[PDB]
């Protein structure tokens, strides 16, 4: 009781200090300015809701003795939130439940008491037509149930809480969704709950009847609103279709839903990456690396970014497949350095011409590549090792025996050492001829490449590109 | 003081990085660590050291003496303000903060040096304060703070001549441009070797002669080595005391190619154990090999590859794999043949190789400004 | 020593002599502008990147 009564009594009110200022300012705003007048294309309540997801990601950790959040639920759920003269008593009810935690004891919600914390939208003239309240009054309890996820006989409490929000989601899909942004501000509440709808299901449940419900969700999308409904319903469509073998990739080629034209700078950034791996996994190399690069330089400024630990790995998988390689550790971190050393040792073998050096990696770190889920692209680098090597040898040696190149590439056979060189010319790596009767492979010396048209093609790509950024500097300037 | 202060940073390198050689280095530094009132810069060095379990009274006898010099500053600051000179509080510890720069860390130095920077109306104390900020910014490798005060140094020398503050300064960039891999600047900052004085950091002038010759054989070709460092009496007589480095320079000049690799093996071994070249010792010889190869190879056209074994360096297959990786590197303009055993050269024009470096920088600046305009304006 | 330029042959001693002032003015005096302009975009960080 002294170790309790000095360390337990400040966890109730100082969260009550900041929760009368963040979602009470959201409840004070997004009931009267999302159901109210307007929250326009330049709104604040979405970014305010962006402020009330991230803060509560790392806010709550403990099972909430002293009712420091276990008493917030009997406070924040007895809410009509209809109009100002009936919420002037509710502005007292933000303080009337504070002494319920203090003078008395509330109901400590420890893994059992969430069932009398969900049935309240009948109590004291509550509604569901005001879904700028009730979609947020879903998400204000729907987040902290599932934020820790706590995975011990809880899943049904998360489910029935989603079912009441799914009842709000059907009223979203059918009933009066126009110019109140009832779809728009709840497409985020659709999108943000889907990740809590998935990590439940990616933990212990199925995946696929939600997909047909998501097709029914994609049905009404772009069918009433063409803003942030075309965007988040397609990355959340793709998120396990890539990991499944279902058709889902040539569908997304001819699909019209490729461009929502705006997706709020962070869901748009990874959007070019989930379809960036689709061209990577189905052999479309050169088209992929520009939507892989564009999916990199549109991401914000966080540090614990473990998906960015994957895109920097994957972006130069396909560039090893094309030949080009940048320095990958050019932004090396204390958390990037350990995530590069097996994969950086791979591209060490690619810039060399050795053949079973590839085999000395693929037995040492063959298990690591299957953890990242990338092995099926790794296995085909032996075509690109041998074309790197045959370009390397033919440029160095001019008149080399074909019964010498195989011993240097440890090919163990001169009789197909002619044959890779045949496919080197069929692909077009080296030009010159082979004296198959003698055995030497002669190469012609290069000639005046300066007086060829091809450096103008190095220019014309970049003349037209540099006039574009001068035009974009004009088009983005005179907003005043 | 900061005048014997650079040998400490060399001996910290001598402590940690030679892993077996960590016994006499932890003794002779501790010979100087737990004397002359040093407190701060060796806690993690003691962590890289052994236990040394009883250092508590070893610290307490010294942090007291740190306080003793600090409290007589606390007894100075009221007797200097009562009957004032030129702010003699500051003016006392504008010489005693460099003690506190050595003894404490940079924070006691930086708040006292920028204090006393505004005191003296003449640069003759200001520009000597700036040399202190340069020298600690080498110890803590403050590569972003040296860029500030070097311009703030150089902005002071133009009024007056200040050649004992200019020729002194040129050694600092000369050690900084060789700290970074920028050798054509380092030989240019080491261009004089005449006004370069018997300094504190290279206490042997002859060690400075070794540093200015090791960088000079990279940066310039041989219309200039055959005029400057073969004919300078200021540079000949100081390596006249050196048997190795005289032979190391002249073997490239005399075309004694076989004995060139012999002393190069000594220097590259020495360059490994030397401080401040050990970040780039593997970069050195691979540039000095390709400098040695192309000098012999651009005299002839029809040279056979087995002529270079007994006259340039032994091992025919050693020549084979080494030239194979440098033509494949895109340098060393020749084209080796294999099965008639000859090396044929070419001469490419100075357009394509001059074109090649232009397309590098054009991509890099376009990489810079495209990435910039995405960050700004959302 | 580049006081004269040419090539020497080893088999029979043939000195193929050639000459051209190739070009120097056009490219490297336009190349150093690029690294001047790189430092200008670096100095844009001290009034834009810090500021807005």
């Amino acid at each position: 009781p002294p170790g309790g009564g000095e360390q337990e009594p400040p966890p109730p009110p100082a969260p009550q200090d900041v929760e009368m200022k963040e979602e009470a300012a959201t409840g004070g705003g997004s009931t009267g300015e999302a159901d109210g007048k307007t929250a326009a294309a330049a709104a604040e309540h979405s970014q305010r809701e962006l402020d009330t997801v991230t803060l509560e990601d790392i806010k709550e950790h403990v099972k909430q003795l002293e009712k420091a959040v276990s008493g917030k639920e009997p406070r924040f759920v007895l809410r009509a939130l209809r109009m100002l003269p009936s919420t002037s008593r509710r502005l007292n009810h933000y303080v009337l439940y504070k002494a319920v935690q203090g003078f008395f004891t509330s109901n400590n919600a420890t893994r059992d008491f969430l069932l009398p914390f969900l049935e309240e939208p009948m109590d004291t003239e509550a509604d569901l037509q005001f879904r700028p309240r009730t979609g947020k009054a879903a998400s204000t309890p729907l987040l902290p149930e599932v934020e820790a996820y706590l995975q011990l006989l809880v899943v049904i409490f998360m489910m029935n809480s989603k079912r009441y929000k799914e009842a709000q989601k059907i009223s979203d899909d059918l009933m009066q969704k126009i110019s109140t942004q009832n779809r728009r501000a709840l497409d985020l509440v659709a999108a943000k709950c889907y990740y809590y709808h998935a990590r439940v299901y990616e933990f212990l449940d199925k995946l696929d009847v939600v997909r047909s419900f998501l097709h029914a969700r994609l049905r009404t999308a772009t069918l009433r609103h063409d803003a942030d409904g075309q965007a988040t319903l397609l990355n959340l469509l793709l998120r396990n279709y890539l990991h499944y073998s279902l058709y889902d990739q040539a569908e997304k080629l001819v699909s019209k839903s490729v461009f929502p034209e705006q997706a709020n700078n962070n869901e748009w950034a990874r959007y070019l990456y989930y379809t960036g791996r689709i061209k990577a996994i189905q052999l479309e190399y050169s088209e992929a690396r520009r939507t892989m690069t564009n999916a990199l330089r549109k991401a914000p400024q966080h540090t614990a970014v473990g998906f960015k630990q994957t895109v920097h790995k994957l972006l130069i998988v396909v560039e090893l497949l094309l030949g080009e390689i940048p320095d990958r550790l050019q932004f090396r971190q204390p958390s990037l350095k350990r995530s590069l050393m097996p994969y950086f040792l791979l591209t060490q073998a690619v810039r060399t011409g050795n053949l079973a050096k590839f085999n000395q990696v693929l037995d040492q770190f063959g298990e690591k590549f299957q953890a990242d889920g990338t092995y099926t692209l790794i296995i085909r680098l032996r075509h690109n090792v041998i074309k790197t090597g045959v370009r390397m040898i033919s440029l160095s040696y001019s008149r080399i025996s074909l019964a010498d190149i195989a011993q240097k590439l440890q090919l163990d056979s001169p009789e197909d050492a002619e044959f890779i060189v045949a496919k080197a010319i069929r692909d077009g790596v080296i030009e010159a001829s082979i004296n198959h009767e003698k055995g030497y492979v002669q190469s012609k010396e290069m000639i005046d490449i300066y007086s060829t048209r091809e450096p103008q093609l190095a220019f014309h790509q970049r003349i037209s590109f540099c006039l574009d950024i001068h035009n974009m500097s004009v088009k983005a300037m005179r907003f005043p | 003081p900061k005048n014997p202060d650079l040998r400490i940073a060399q001996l910290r390198f001598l402590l940690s990085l030679p892993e077996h050689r960590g016994d006499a280095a932890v003794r002779d530094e501790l010979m100087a660590a737990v004397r002359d009132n040093n407190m701060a810069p060796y806690y993690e060095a003691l962590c890289k050291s052994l236990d040394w379990q009883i250092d508590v009274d070893l610290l307490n006898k010294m942090k007291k003496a740190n306080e003793d010099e600090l409290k007589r500053l606390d007894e100075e600051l009221e007797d200097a303000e009562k009957n004032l000179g030129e702010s003699e509080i500051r003016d006392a510890m504008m010489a005693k903060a460099e003690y506190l720069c050595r003894i404490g860390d940079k924070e006691g130095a930086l708040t006292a040096f920028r204090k006393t920077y505004d005191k003296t109306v003449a640069l003759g104390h200001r520009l000597d304060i700036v040399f202190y900020l340069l020298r600690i910014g080498l110890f803590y490798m403050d590569n972003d703070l040296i860029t500030r005060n070097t311009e703030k140094a150089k902005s002071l020398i133009e009024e007056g001549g200040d050649w004992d503050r200019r020729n002194r300064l040129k050694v600092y960039q000369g050690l900084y441009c060789v700290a970074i891999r920028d050798f054509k600047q380092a030989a240019e900052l080491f261009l004089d070797t005449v006004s370069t004085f018997t300094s504190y950091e290279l206490m042997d002038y002859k060690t400075f002669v070794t540093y200015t010759v090791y960088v000079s054989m990279i940066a310039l070709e041989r219309p200039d080595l055959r005029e400057k460092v073969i004919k300078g009496a200021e540079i000949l007589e100081v390596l006249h005391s050196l048997p190795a480095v005289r032979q190391y320079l002249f073997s490239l000049y005399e075309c004694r190619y076989s004995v060139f690799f012999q002393s190069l093996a000594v220097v590259e071994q020495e360059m490994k154990k030397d401080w401040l070249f050990a970040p780039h010792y593997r970069y050195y010889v691979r540039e000095m090999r390709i400098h040695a190869y192309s000098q012999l190879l651009e005299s002839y056209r029809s040279l056979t590859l087995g002529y270079m074994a007994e006259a340039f360096g032994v091992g025919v297959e050693f020549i084979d794999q080494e030239l194979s990786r440098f033509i494949a590197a895109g340098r060393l303009h020749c084209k080796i043949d294999k099965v008639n055993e000859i090396v044929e050269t070419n001469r490419p024009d100075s357009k394509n190789w001059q074109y090649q470096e232009t397309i590098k920088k054009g991509d890099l600046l376009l990489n810079r400004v495209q990435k910039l305009s995405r960050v700004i304006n959302m | 020593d580049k006081k004269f330029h040419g090539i020497l042959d080893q088999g029979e001693g043939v000195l193929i002599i050639f000459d051209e002032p190739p070009v120097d003015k056009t490219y490297e005096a336009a190349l150093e502008t690029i690294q001047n302009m790189s430092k200008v975009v670096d100095s844009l960080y001290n009034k834009a990147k810090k500021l807005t």
Partner: peptide
């Protein structure tokens, strides 16, 4: 190619010259 490269940098320096006159007056004037 050099002259067009200059054209992009100059208007970018002009772009900050409008972002100095956009943000530094909305708090001042309103």
């Amino acid at each position: 190619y050099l002259a067009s490269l200059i054209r992009s940098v100059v208007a970018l320096h002009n772009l900050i010259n409008n972002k100095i006159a956009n943000r530094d007056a909305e708090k001042k004037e309103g």
